[PDB]
Structure 1
């Protein structure tokens, strides 16, 4: 059975106006800005952007990749598909 989300989990993450996007739950570094309550720091592959999202917008990657893991014209998306498949836990710093 599923657990709560934890750092390292792989997802597609939904933001308004954007397609479901390859992403991971990030850790928060010592001294770094913390997310609001009930939100997670989401690192978007390809764009390498971070946004704070709640579980309603987070779709586990294994379950969802058949639906959501297809190329997209949007900037950074195809790079993101490569990262989540091939090195999802690397530093993109």
Structure 2
């Protein structure tokens, strides 16, 4: 039975204007900017961008990969697919 989202969780994350995108829930570093309430820090594989999203835009990676885990013309996407499959917990700084 599912829990709330926690840092380390792998997802596809949905932003307007973009396809469902390989991502993870990030930690917040000591001293770093906190997200707004009820939002999560989302790290997008491939582009290495961070956005703040709520659960309605977060789809568990395992359940959704068959649908969303296919190659895409969009910049960074295919790099993103490799990262989430091959080293999803790596430092990408």
Q: What band does the TM-score fall into relative to the shorter chain?
A: over 0.9
| Stretches of structure 1 lacking an aligned partner (at least 5 in a row) | none
Question: Runs of 4+ in structure 1 displaced over 6 angstroms?
Answer: none
**Displacement of 1:60 after TM fit?**
0.1
Cα shift readout 1:16-62 (whole Å, capped 9, x = no counterpart): 00000000000000000000000000000000000000000000000
| Stretches of structure 2 lacking an aligned partner (at least 5 in a row) | none
Aligned residues between the structures: 93
**Displacement of 1:5 after TM fit?**
0.1
**Displacement of 1:14 after TM fit?**
0.0
Cα shift readout 1:66-85 (whole Å, capped 9, x = no counterpart): 00000000000000000000
Q: What is the TM-score when the length of structure 2 is the normalising length?
A: 1.00
- RMSD of aligned C-alpha atoms? 0.1
